[PDB]
Amino acid sequence: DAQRMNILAGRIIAETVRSTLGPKGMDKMLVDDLGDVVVTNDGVTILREMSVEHPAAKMLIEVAKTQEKEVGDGTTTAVVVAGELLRKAEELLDQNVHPTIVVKGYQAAAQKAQELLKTIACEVGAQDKEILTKIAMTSITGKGAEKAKEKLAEIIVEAVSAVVDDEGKVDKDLIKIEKKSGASIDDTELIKGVLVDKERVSAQMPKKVTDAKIALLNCAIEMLKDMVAEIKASGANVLFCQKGIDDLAQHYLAKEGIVAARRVKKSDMEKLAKATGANVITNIKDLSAQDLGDAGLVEERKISGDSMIFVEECKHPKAVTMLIRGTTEHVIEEVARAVDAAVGVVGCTIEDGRIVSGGGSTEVELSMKLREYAEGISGREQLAVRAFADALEVIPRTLAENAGLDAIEILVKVRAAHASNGNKCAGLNVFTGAVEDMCENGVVEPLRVKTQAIQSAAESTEMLLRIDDVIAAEKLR
Amino acid sequence: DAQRMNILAGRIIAETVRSTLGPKGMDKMLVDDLGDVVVTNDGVTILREMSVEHPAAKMLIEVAKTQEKEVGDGTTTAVVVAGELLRKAEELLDQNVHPTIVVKGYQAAAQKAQELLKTIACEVGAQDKEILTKIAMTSITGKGAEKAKEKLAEIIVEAVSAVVDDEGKVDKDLIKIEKKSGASIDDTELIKGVLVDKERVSAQMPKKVTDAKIALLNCAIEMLKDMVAEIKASGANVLFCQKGIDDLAQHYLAKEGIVAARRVKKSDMEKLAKATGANVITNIKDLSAQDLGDAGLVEERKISGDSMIFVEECKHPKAVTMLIRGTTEHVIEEVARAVDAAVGVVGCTIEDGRIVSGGGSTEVELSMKLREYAEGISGREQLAVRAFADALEVIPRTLAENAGLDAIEILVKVRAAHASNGNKCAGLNVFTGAVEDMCENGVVEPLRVKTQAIQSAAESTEMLLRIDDVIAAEKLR
Amino acid sequence: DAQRMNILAGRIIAETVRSTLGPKGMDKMLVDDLGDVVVTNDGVTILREMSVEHPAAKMLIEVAKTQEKEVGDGTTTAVVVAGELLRKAEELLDQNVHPTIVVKGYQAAAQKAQELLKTIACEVGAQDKEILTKIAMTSITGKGAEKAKEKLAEIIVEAVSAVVDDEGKVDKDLIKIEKKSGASIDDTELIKGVLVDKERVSAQMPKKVTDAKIALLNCAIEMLKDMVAEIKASGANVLFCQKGIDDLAQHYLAKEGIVAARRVKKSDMEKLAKATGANVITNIKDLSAQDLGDAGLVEERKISGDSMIFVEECKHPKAVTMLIRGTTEHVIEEVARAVDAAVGVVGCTIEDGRIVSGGGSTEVELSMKLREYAEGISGREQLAVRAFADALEVIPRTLAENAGLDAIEILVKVRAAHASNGNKCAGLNVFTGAVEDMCENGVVEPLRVKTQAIQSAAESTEMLLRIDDVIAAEKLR
Amino acid sequence: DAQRMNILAGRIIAETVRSTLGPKGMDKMLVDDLGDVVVTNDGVTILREMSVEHPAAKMLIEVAKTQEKEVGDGTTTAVVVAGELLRKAEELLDQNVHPTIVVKGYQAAAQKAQELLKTIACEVGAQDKEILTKIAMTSITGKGAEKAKEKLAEIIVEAVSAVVDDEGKVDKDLIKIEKKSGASIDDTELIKGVLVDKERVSAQMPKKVTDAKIALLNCAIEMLKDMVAEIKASGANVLFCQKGIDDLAQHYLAKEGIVAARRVKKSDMEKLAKATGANVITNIKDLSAQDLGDAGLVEERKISGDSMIFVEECKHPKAVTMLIRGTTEHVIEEVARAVDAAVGVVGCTIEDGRIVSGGGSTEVELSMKLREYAEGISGREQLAVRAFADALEVIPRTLAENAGLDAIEILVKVRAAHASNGNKCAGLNVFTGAVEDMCENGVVEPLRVKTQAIQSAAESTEMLLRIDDVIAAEKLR
C-alpha cells in the first residue's frame, strides 16, 4: 500500500529522463520559478535540477550521484534500469510474490549479471588510441552532435593519455577545464600547460619571457619606489597582480623588459600557485627568489576573437589544460559536460581494459543469458530472475522509441540475432535503422559503465522493496 | 471490436469445463429447464449439455466433437488449450499486433509442435499388456474413481487386444457396449462373444444348443403349417423372431427341441446379422440353410437380478461384448463413457505405438522447446510463437490448481526439472504433491491425444482470428 | 446535409468488405435470422447476402453486379475504391468545394486513368499458356488456398483455351460447371465433352456405346409395342427419356443392346439439345433418324462416391465441362466461385491481350501519374483530381493492412520505387513482406479488371454527388 | 501531450502577425496597459511589443530577431512558415509519426531547399541600379504606401551604393539615420556627409566655413584668456563644445570669424570623432593641430521647420546620412523602419548577387520541386518532406487571403502555371488579381531573405519537436 507509492515515486523519476537516452534522444525543457528556460538532452543535468522532495525519489537520485562519481557516464542508463526493475517487481507483487523473494531473485540475478559481463567484455590495450577514440565517440554523441566529436574525441584521447601516470591511473584533477566564449565550437584545442585569460597591460611591454620566474602579487600598486626595488631584487621576470597596477608602475615595468598583467582573476592566482608552485604573498617583505614559479615558456598568442597568455613547456607539472571555445554560454556549458563524460569513459577504459559493445547489444545478450539462468531456479525465486532479465530490454526499446522505429519488431530482430550462439554485439544503429555489429560500427563503452550501473540499479530497488511502511516519527536525529 | 466478443465467447466455453481437468478435478452441476440435476467431472458431457447458442461457442464445440471422434479422450485438454490461446492472442491484439501475424505465428508454432511431439514420444510394443493397462489407467482415472480401474483396465485391455485385426487396426463397432443394472460396479466383466437380453419364451423349451444355426425372422407368426415346414426344412436349431410367435407355434417349437425367443429387439437383430452373418428375411420362401449363422455355444445363464441368453465360443466373429454392471442408472452411464474413452486411447496406442508422459510434462517440455524455437524468429511473427509456448502452461497449472497446490511455485519447479537437458517426463503427481517421473508412475497417454488436440486447438483459434466483423445477412442458404 | 448520409451509406458498404481484399484478407461472418453461419473471404458473396435497404447502398451494390457481369473479378476492388472516393470527396465538401466541381474533377481524372492504363498494360499472346496460368493463379489465390491452384489453374486454362472460337471470343456458357461431392478437392478434373449425372437404369444393359446416336424423348412410357417399333426403326442406339421408362420397356431396351436412363434432369435435356444437336420431341411420330445427336463415345465410368455417364470424344460441339470435386458442400460451392472468377480473367486476357501487374503496383503507378496530371489543372477542378489520385492508394494500403504490415511505410517504399522513372510493376508481395517486381512474381491481372473497376467506381460516386436532397414522393411508377 | 501546447503557443505567435504579410496586409491594433494605441502593418513591430511570456513563444520570437539581424526583411515570412510547419507537424503526430522522424524529414528537406534556392536565384550586377531599385520597391511597399517609394527607393539605392567598399560589403553603420519632424514625407533626402542638428549660438558669427578644421571640446567655458589663446594657436576654424560656451567667449568667437555651437549632443561628438577623425580632449593642453578633423564644407542651411548644420563634401569619411522628414512622430518612425529594411535587402543583393522573384512565386516553385524530391524517399521520413513542401504554400495563400481573393483557386492556377517547368517567377500580383511574371512586374527580393528565413523556420521547429515534456526545476542558473 504505502510501499507502492515509493515504487511509484521511483518510476516517476525514471520516466522523467527516459526519453533522453541515446543520440536520437529527446530534449527536456527546464523552467525554474523565475521563468528561466533550459533545454538539454543530458540526463544527469535534469536529475539535479528537479524539485525532488519525495524520499523514495531521493533514494533513487543517489544512484546517479554514485554512478557519476564512480564512472561519469551511464547515469541515465542506471536510472532507467532501476525504474523498469520497479515496474517488473510491481507485477510480481500483483501475483502474490512476497517482496523478500523478489529481492532474493534480484540479488541473485544481479550477481549472475556481474559474472556474465566479465565474460562478454573484450580486452583492449591501454595504448590503442583508435579504440580510445571510439570510446569517446560513443560517450559524447549521446548528447546531440555529429562528427564534431571526431575532432574533440581525439583531443580528449590525447589529453587523457598525457596525464596517465606510471600506474595506469587517471586523476581527473590533472586535466584542468577552462571555459571561454569564442567564435565557434571548433576552436576547442588542447594546450600542454596552463592558461591565463589576460593580455599585457602595456603594448610596449615585451610579449615573451623564457625561463620565467612567476611572481604572484596580491597587493594593489595604484613608498612605491621601495616597492619596485624589493620586487626587482627578488630576481623575477614575470609578475601576476590580482589587483590593479599603477600607471607609472606600468611604465617602469615596460622599460625594464618585464611583462605584467593586472586584474588577474582569483582562479588564475590559484592555478599558478598550485601548478608552478608559488605562494600568495601578503606583505612585500615576504617576496623572495624562492617563492617564484618556474616555466619554460610564457607566450601571449592571439586566437580567433581573443588574445590570451599561454604558459607552455612546463616540465615540472606534467599536466595539461582544455581550452573550451563556443558561441554562447549554454553551448559552452553543454560542451563541458560532454568532456567530463568522455574523460570518465576513457579513464575507465585505461584503468580496466575491458569494454563491451553499446547500442543495447550487451543488454540484450545479458538479458538472454539471464533468462537461461532463470530456467534452472526452483521456488518462487525464479520469477524475479525472469523479470530481472526482461527488465534489461528497457534500454534497447527506449533507443528504438527515440529513434522513431517500432520498438517491438526491432527488439524482435535483435533477439533473433543473439539467439543460438549469435553475434553478442548485434544492436540497433539508430542512424541507419538496421541491426548491425556495434563493434564494427565503433559503438563501444567501458565495462565499468555497465557493471556499476546494473549494480547501482539493483541495490536501490532492493532497498525500496524492503520498505513496507512509512511511520510518522518525532524529532529524531 | 465485434471480433473480440467472439474470442470472449470461446473463453467462456473453455473456463466452463476448465476446472474439470485431471483426477482431482471439480464436479459441475447441470440443471435443465425441468429441474433435473446431473453432477459430473467429464468435460465432453458438459459440452454437449450446455445451452450453447453463440456461433463462436459452437465453432469451439466442434473441436471437442472432432477430438472425441478421432481420439475419444483429451477433449477437455483441447478446449482448455484453445481458450488459453484465445487469451494470449487477445494480449497480442492489445499490443497492436495484426491478427494475421498472430495466425502466422500460431500456424508456424503448431507445425513445430507436431515435429517436436514426434521426437518426445516413446515407442512401445503392440503386445505389451502392461503399458496398455497403464494407458487405460491414466485415461479413466481422470473422471473420479481409484483402483477400481485396475480391474476394469485389464478387462478393457483384454477386450481391445482380442479384436485387433492382422493390420493393427481397431474397429470400435466390433466391441459392443451393453448396459444392465446390477448389484455393484465390480460385477462388470468381459464376454467372448455376443449377448441377447432375452429369455426362452417357454420354459419347456431346451435351454442350450451347441453348433447353433442362428435364424433371423422378421415376420410375425400369430398357412401357418406350411410356415413351420419351410423353417424346419432349412435345417436350423436357433430362431430369433423380431415380432411375436404364436402360442401354438411356441408349443411345436418346444416339442422339436428348438429354442426360440420372441419380442427380440431391433438392435439384437442387427448385431446378430453383423456378427454371426445372417440376413433379415422379408419372405419365408427366402429362408435357406445358408442364411443361418454359426455359433459354438448358445446358453441362457441367469445373473444377479436377471436371466439372459449368452452366445459364447464363436470363433468366426473375432469380436467381444462388454457387460456393464452398476447400482444406479447414472452410475452405469458414467462407466460407459469411461469405456468409450479407454477404448480410444488403447486403440490409438496399438495403431500408432507412440505414447508420451503425462502430468503436463509433455506440455511443459513442448512449451520449453517452443520458446527455444521462438528465439530464432525475426519480425512480429515471433511474439505469437512465444504466446503459443506459454499457452501450453495452462494444462499443468490447471492440474495444480485442481490439486489444491500453488500453481505458481509448482509450475516453477517443473520448469526447473525440464531446464538444460532435464527429465522430459517430470510432472506434478496430484496424489503426493511432489514432482516425479511420470513414466515411473504409470501416467501415460497416446501421442495422438496430444497431436490431435493441439492441432484442433490451433485450427479453431486460427479460424476465429480471421473473423473481424459479423454482418447481418438475409435469407441465405 | 441529407446528401452526406448517402456518402456515409456507401462507405459503410465499402468498409464492410474492405478487409477481405487480397490473399491475406480477413474473413467475415454472415448470420441470417435463422442462425445459419457462413464464413467467407469473397467480397461479392458478402455484398449479395447483406440486408441492404438504404438506396445509396443499393446504388453502390450495382457496381459489384456490373463489375462481376462484365469481368468476374475486381468487384471488391471497385467497391473499396468507390468508398475511398466518397471519403476523399467528403473532405473536399468540407473545404467548400461544390459537388459539380468534384464531379468534373473525378470525371476528368477517370478518363485520364483510362488513357494511362492503356499505356501501362503489357501485351501478351492469346496462345501463351504460361501467362494465362499466372492470370488464373493471381485471380484465384485471392480467396485463400496455396499451390492447389497450380493444378486447378492449368485445368482452367485448358478448359477456356478449348472453347475459344476463331474470333477470340469466350462464351462462358460453353463451359458447363458441374458440382459433385467427392473424396477431396484435388479430384477436380476437366472432361472433353459433356456430362450426365445418371446411371443405367438396368445393369444388364450394355454400358458402352461408340458412334452414339443420341435420342431425346420427352414422353413417359409406363400401343406400347408400336412405340418400340417406331423408335427402333429411327436407327438410334442411345435414348434419354426425361420422364420414366416402363419396367417391361427397360427389359426390351436391355435385350436389344440399347443403353437407356430414366428420370433424366431437365438441364441434361437442354445441354444435349444444345451441344449434340437434338430436338425435344413432343409426339413419337416426329422422331426421325435426323433428330439424333452424334457422339464418338458414351461411357458410364464410376468415380469416388458416385457413378455417372460421361459423353466424351464429341468433335462437333467444341464444348467442355468442369467436374468439381470436394469434401463438403460449402467447400465445393467455394471452389465453383473460384472457377467462375478465373474463367472471367482468363477470358478477358484472351479477348483483350492486355494485362497489368497486381499487388497494388498498377494502382500506385496510376496514382503517381495522376498527381502529375493534376498539377497542370487550373481552377478548383484540380483539387478533385488530387483526391482521385490519392484515393487509389486505398488498394495497396488495404493489402498491407491485411498482410499485417505497417501500411504507412510500405506505401512509402512502393511510391519510392515508382518515383522518377521507376519500376511500374513494383508492389508489395504479401507472402514475403518486401517490395518486389510483381511481374517476376507472377502476379498479374487483365487490363479490363482495372479499367472497368475504376470507371464503375467513378460513375457511381459521380451519381451520388449529384444528389443533394431526398424528397418524400407519393405513388409514382 | 505537454509537448503539443508548445506547438500551440508557436502557432499563436504566427497567426498573430499572419495577416500582416504583403502589401495588401491587414493592420493590427496594439494597446498597452496605459491605453496608448498603435496601428501597424509591420510584423516585427508587433512581435516585440507583444506581452509574450510563454517560453515556446519566446523561442519562436528569436527567429524574427535572428532574421532581422542577419537580413532585415522576411521576419514575417519566417514566422509564418515556422507556424505552418508546426501545424503540418501536428498532423503527422496525429498519424503516429515519431517526432524525430519529422525532424529528420524537416532537416533533410531544409537542406534540399537551400540547394534548390541556389539554382532558382538569378544573378544581378552590383552596379545595376534598376534592379536594386526594384529590390527596394518590393521590400518597402509591403508596409503600405504606393509610388512614394519610387522617390525613396532611388534615394536608398544611391545611399547604399555610395558606402559600398572595394570588397562589395555594406556596413550599415556607415549610413547614419537622422529623423526630424517636417512639412511632408517627400522632403526626405540624402546628404553626402554628416549632419549636426544644431545652429550657430550667435547670429553675428559667420555661417559658412570652407576647408574646416573640426575641433571637439569637452570642457565647459562659462584663465579664460589663456584658454582662447591656446585654441586659436592650434589653427582651427570650427569648434564643437559639448558643454556650454561663455557669452563673452561667444563674442570673441564671433569677432574672429569662427563658427561655434554649444550644447552639442553626445551623439554628435561621437559621429564627428568617428567620421572626420578627431579626439575627445579632456585637457586644453592636449588640443593640437593634428587632433582636428578635415571637411570640405560646413554649412548651416535651414529646412522646412528647422535650421541645422550640414557638413557636406567630406571625401575622407566615404559615408552619408539620411535626412528623414515627415508630418508626425509616428509617421517618421514608420519611415525609419522602411529604410532599415530596404538597406538590408539592397545590401544583401550587392553582397550576394542572387535574387528570386517575390509574390510567393519562389515559394510555389520550391514547393513543387520539393514534392518531386519527396517521391523518392523510402521510410516514414518521406511524410515530413511532403508536409515541408505543402507548408511553403502558406505564403502565397496568405497573400491571396489578404488580397481578398479565393486562396484555393489562386493557389491552384499558380501551381498550374508552375507545373511541368512553368514560369518559375509566376505569382499573384495583388494589385491586379491575375497571375503574372513577377520578374516582369519588378517584384524581386534577395536570395538571402528566403534562405535565411527558411533555415530559421526549420531550425526553430526542429528545436520545438525535440521537446517532449517540460519539467519543474528549482533554482538553476
Ligand SMILES: Nc1ncnc2c1ncn2[C@@H]1O[C@H](COP(=O)(O)OP(=O)(O)O)[C@@H](O)[C@H]1O
Ligand atoms: N551510435 C550509437 N548507436 C546506438 N546506441 C548508442 C550510440 N551512441 C550512444 N548510444 C547509446 O546511448 C546510451 C547513453 O546515452 P545517454 O543517455 O546520452 O548517456 P548516459 O550514458 O548518461 O545514459 C548508451 O547506452 C549507448 O548504448
Ligand SMILES: Nc1ncnc2c1ncn2[C@@H]1O[C@H](COP(=O)(O)OP(=O)(O)O)[C@@H](O)[C@H]1O
Ligand atoms: N497421476 C497423475 N499425475 C499427474 N498428472 C496426471 C495424472 N493422471 C493424469 N494426469 C494428467 O491429466 C490429464 C488428462 O486428465 P483428464 O482431464 O482427466 O482427461 P482428458 O485427457 O479428457 O482431459 C493429462 O494431461 C495428464 O497429464
Ligand SMILES: Nc1ncnc2c1ncn2[C@@H]1O[C@H](COP(=O)(O)OP(=O)(O)O)[C@@H](O)[C@H]1O
Ligand atoms: N499473390 C498476390 N500478391 C499480391 N496481391 C495479390 C495476389 N493475389 C491477388 N492479389 C490482389 O488481390 C486483389 C483481389 O483480391 P479479392 O478481393 O480476393 O478479389 P477481387 O478482385 O474480387 O477484389 C487484387 O487487386 C490483387 O492485386
Ligand SMILES: Nc1ncnc2c1ncn2[C@@H]1O[C@H](COP(=O)(O)OP(=O)(O)O)[C@@H](O)[C@H]1O
Ligand atoms: N508588390 C508585391 N507583389 C506581391 N507580393 C509582394 C509585393 N511586395 C512584397 N510582397 C511579398 O510580401 C512579403 C513580405 O511582406 P512583409 O510581411 O510586409 O515583410 P517581411 O518581409 O518582413 O515579411 C514577401 O514575401 C513578398 O513576396
Ligand SMILES: [Mg+2]
Ligand atoms: Mg552520456
Ligand SMILES: [Mg+2]
Ligand atoms: Mg478428461
Ligand SMILES: [Mg+2]
Ligand atoms: Mg479475386
Ligand SMILES: [Mg+2]
Ligand atoms: Mg518587408
